[PDB]
Write a protein that holds these residues in place. Sequence first.
Motif, PDB file in Angstrom:
ATOM      1  N   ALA C  20       0.825  -1.154  -0.080  1.00 20.07           N
ATOM      2  CA  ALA C  20      -0.086  -0.111  -0.023  1.00 20.07           C
ATOM      3  C   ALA C  20       1.111   1.374   0.061  1.00 20.07           C
ATOM      4  CB  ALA C  20      -0.659   0.052   1.215  1.00 20.07           C
ATOM      5  N   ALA C  21       0.384   2.313  -0.421  1.00 21.85           N
ATOM      6  CA  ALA C  21       1.065   3.691  -0.737  1.00 21.85           C
ATOM      7  C   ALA C  21       0.726   4.493   0.308  1.00 21.85           C
ATOM      8  CB  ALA C  21       1.055   4.127  -2.017  1.00 21.85           C
ATOM      9  N   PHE C  22       1.558   5.667   0.468  1.00 23.67           N
ATOM     10  CA  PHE C  22       1.285   6.625   1.589  1.00 23.67           C
ATOM     11  C   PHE C  22       2.251   7.862   1.198  1.00 23.67           C
ATOM     12  CE2 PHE C  22       3.188   8.423   5.324  1.00 23.67           C
ATOM     13  CZ  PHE C  22       2.174   8.682   6.211  1.00 23.67           C
ATOM     14  N   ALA C  23       1.649   9.014   1.174  1.00 23.87           N
ATOM     15  CA  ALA C  23       2.453   9.994   0.535  1.00 23.87           C
ATOM     16  C   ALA C  23       2.012  11.024   1.601  1.00 23.87           C
ATOM     17  CB  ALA C  23       1.842  10.515  -0.717  1.00 23.87           C
ATOM     18  N   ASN C  57      -3.657   9.427   7.514  1.00 21.56           N
ATOM     19  CA  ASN C  57      -3.344   8.509   6.418  1.00 21.56           C
ATOM     20  C   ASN C  57      -2.734   7.270   7.112  1.00 21.56           C
ATOM     21  OD1 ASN C  57      -2.707   7.760   4.082  1.00 21.56           O
ATOM     22  ND2 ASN C  57      -1.343   9.279   3.291  1.00 21.56           N
ATOM     23  N   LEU C  58      -1.679   7.564   7.712  1.00 22.91           N
ATOM     24  CA  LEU C  58      -0.917   6.245   8.196  1.00 22.91           C
ATOM     25  C   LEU C  58      -1.990   5.235   9.104  1.00 22.91           C
ATOM     26  CD1 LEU C  58       1.593   4.759   8.279  1.00 22.91           C
ATOM     27  CD2 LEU C  58       2.146   6.054  10.663  1.00 22.91           C
ATOM     28  N   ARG C  59      -2.854   5.845   9.836  1.00 24.40           N
ATOM     29  CA  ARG C  59      -4.028   5.013  10.167  1.00 24.40           C
ATOM     30  C   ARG C  59      -4.351   3.776   8.937  1.00 24.40           C
ATOM     31  NH1 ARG C  59      -7.384   6.778  13.023  1.00 24.40           N
ATOM     32  NH2 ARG C  59      -5.546   7.887  13.490  1.00 24.40           N
ATOM     33  N   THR C  60      -4.806   4.450   7.987  1.00 20.17           N
ATOM     34  CA  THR C  60      -5.592   3.426   7.147  1.00 20.17           C
ATOM     35  C   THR C  60      -4.759   2.618   6.028  1.00 20.17           C
ATOM     36  OG1 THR C  60      -7.778   3.277   5.960  1.00 20.17           O
ATOM     37  CG2 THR C  60      -6.455   5.195   5.368  1.00 20.17           C
ATOM     38  N   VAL C  61      -3.673   3.254   5.740  1.00 20.64           N
ATOM     39  CA  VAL C  61      -2.685   2.665   5.049  1.00 20.64           C
ATOM     40  C   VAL C  61      -2.278   1.363   5.846  1.00 20.64           C
ATOM     41  CG1 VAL C  61      -0.609   3.698   5.752  1.00 20.64           C
ATOM     42  CG2 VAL C  61      -0.798   2.646   3.571  1.00 20.64           C
ATOM     43  N   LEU C  62      -2.397   1.506   7.179  1.00 24.31           N
ATOM     44  CA  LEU C  62      -1.713   0.205   7.970  1.00 24.31           C
ATOM     45  C   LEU C  62      -2.976  -0.795   8.356  1.00 24.31           C
ATOM     46  CD1 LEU C  62       0.406  -0.543  11.010  1.00 24.31           C
ATOM     47  CD2 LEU C  62      -1.874  -0.966  11.162  1.00 24.31           C
ATOM     48  N   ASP C  63      -4.281  -0.039   8.451  1.00 25.45           N
ATOM     49  CA  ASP C  63      -5.686  -0.911   8.696  1.00 25.45           C
ATOM     50  C   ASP C  63      -5.824  -1.809   7.333  1.00 25.45           C
ATOM     51  OD1 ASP C  63      -8.240  -1.330  10.391  1.00 25.45           O
ATOM     52  OD2 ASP C  63      -8.836  -0.726   8.235  1.00 25.45           O
ATOM     53  N   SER C  64      -5.249  -1.288   6.352  1.00 23.25           N
ATOM     54  CA  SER C  64      -5.748  -1.779   4.941  1.00 23.25           C
ATOM     55  C   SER C  64      -5.000  -3.323   4.846  1.00 23.25           C
ATOM     56  CB  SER C  64      -4.811  -0.986   3.833  1.00 23.25           C
ATOM     57  OG  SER C  64      -4.900  -1.379   2.808  1.00 23.25           O
TER      58      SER C  64
ATOM     59  N   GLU D  30     -16.690  16.156   5.222  1.00 18.43           N
ATOM     60  CA  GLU D  30     -16.073  15.237   4.379  1.00 18.43           C
ATOM     61  C   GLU D  30     -16.544  13.868   4.348  1.00 18.43           C
ATOM     62  OE1 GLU D  30     -11.843  13.975   5.073  1.00 18.43           O
ATOM     63  OE2 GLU D  30     -11.960  15.275   6.980  1.00 18.43           O
ATOM     64  N   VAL D  31     -15.997  13.142   3.466  1.00 20.95           N
ATOM     65  CA  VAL D  31     -15.727  11.483   3.981  1.00 20.95           C
ATOM     66  C   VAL D  31     -14.148  11.433   3.473  1.00 20.95           C
ATOM     67  CG1 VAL D  31     -17.994  10.977   3.478  1.00 20.95           C
ATOM     68  CG2 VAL D  31     -16.474  10.953   1.581  1.00 20.95           C
ATOM     69  N   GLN D  32     -13.489  10.489   4.376  1.00 21.46           N
ATOM     70  CA  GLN D  32     -12.177   9.876   4.028  1.00 21.46           C
ATOM     71  C   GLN D  32     -12.356   8.808   3.183  1.00 21.46           C
ATOM     72  OE1 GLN D  32      -9.483   9.514   6.877  1.00 21.46           O
ATOM     73  NE2 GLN D  32     -10.195   7.571   7.839  1.00 21.46           N
ATOM     74  N   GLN D  33     -11.653   8.760   2.295  1.00 20.44           N
ATOM     75  CA  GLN D  33     -11.627   7.272   1.753  1.00 20.44           C
ATOM     76  C   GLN D  33     -10.140   6.712   2.098  1.00 20.44           C
ATOM     77  OE1 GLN D  33     -13.587   6.646  -1.670  1.00 20.44           O
ATOM     78  NE2 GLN D  33     -14.974   8.309  -1.488  1.00 20.44           N
ATOM     79  N   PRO D  34     -10.560   5.597   2.555  1.00 19.88           N
ATOM     80  CA  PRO D  34      -8.819   4.955   2.692  1.00 19.88           C
ATOM     81  C   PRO D  34      -8.387   4.149   1.931  1.00 19.88           C
ATOM     82  CG  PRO D  34     -10.705   3.579   4.022  1.00 19.88           C
ATOM     83  CD  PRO D  34     -11.366   5.074   3.368  1.00 19.88           C
ATOM     84  N   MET D  35      -7.114   3.496   2.032  1.00 19.64           N
ATOM     85  CA  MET D  35      -6.560   2.697   1.160  1.00 19.64           C
ATOM     86  C   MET D  35      -7.133   1.516   0.797  1.00 19.64           C
ATOM     87  SD  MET D  35      -4.177   4.007  -0.112  1.00 19.64           S
ATOM     88  CE  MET D  35      -3.621   2.588  -1.146  1.00 19.64           C
ATOM     89  N   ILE D  36      -7.826   1.307  -0.434  1.00 20.88           N
ATOM     90  CA  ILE D  36      -7.809   0.213  -0.935  1.00 20.88           C
ATOM     91  C   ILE D  36      -6.836  -0.070  -2.085  1.00 20.88           C
ATOM     92  CG2 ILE D  36      -8.841  -0.695  -3.342  1.00 20.88           C
ATOM     93  CD1 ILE D  36     -11.430  -1.347  -1.241  1.00 20.88           C
TER      94      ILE D  36
END
Lengths: 41, 49, 98, 42
Positions: C20-23, C57-64, D30-36
């Motif tokens: 997964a990516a993270f910028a 961001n880092l949250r969900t890049v790792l929840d991913s 908003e809505v955030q949308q996460p990493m898919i």
Amino acid sequence: NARVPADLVIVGDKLVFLEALERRVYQATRVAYPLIGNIDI
Amino acid sequence: HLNRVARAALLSDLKRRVCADMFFMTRHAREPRLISAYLSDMVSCTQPS
Amino acid sequence: VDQPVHNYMVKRIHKRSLSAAFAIASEALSLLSNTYVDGTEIDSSLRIRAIQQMARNLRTVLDSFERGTADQLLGVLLEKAPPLSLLSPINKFQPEGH
Amino acid sequence: RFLELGLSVACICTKFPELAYVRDGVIQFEVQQPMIARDGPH
């Protein structure tokens, strides 16, 4: 162990999880939920 | 990320939703296991917030 | 007269992976590196906003990864399973083999 | 009446009676949308 809310249905003689993960996962997004495959006749 | 198969048929699959089932009540005075098939599947359905 | 049989099987592992990516934008990176701080409140708020964005961001890049292992399992299980319409008559109508 | 019946709970208590010394509302969220990403080379 930990308690977790999920639905368990007894079929035949086996207790099986009945998971329909489309809501928790694959949701509002860009991933192909499998189990929607196509057939050719 | 779909192509010209889903909505070029938006008028060829949906307009199904242009040919079967309908406005409730009172000609066929006679049926309870589908009247709640758009009654028992239109009230509660999807994603949370 | 029949004599008993032993069977030996060997299966090999198959490799996959997940990414997964993270910028972070140059604005936020410069704020975080503490290069151009003026020692005033107005930049403390911006730095806190940059940190909160890094977080959100880092949250969900790792929840991913956790939410992606399920997709991997579905993929492999779908690829694995023969259809019921062909497996059922094989194992019921046919007892043993050969 | 308008307590014990129903004709209201789906709204929110927030505040302006005398309204419009208030000009001005373009109010949003908003809505955030996460990493898919999938699994597979996509």
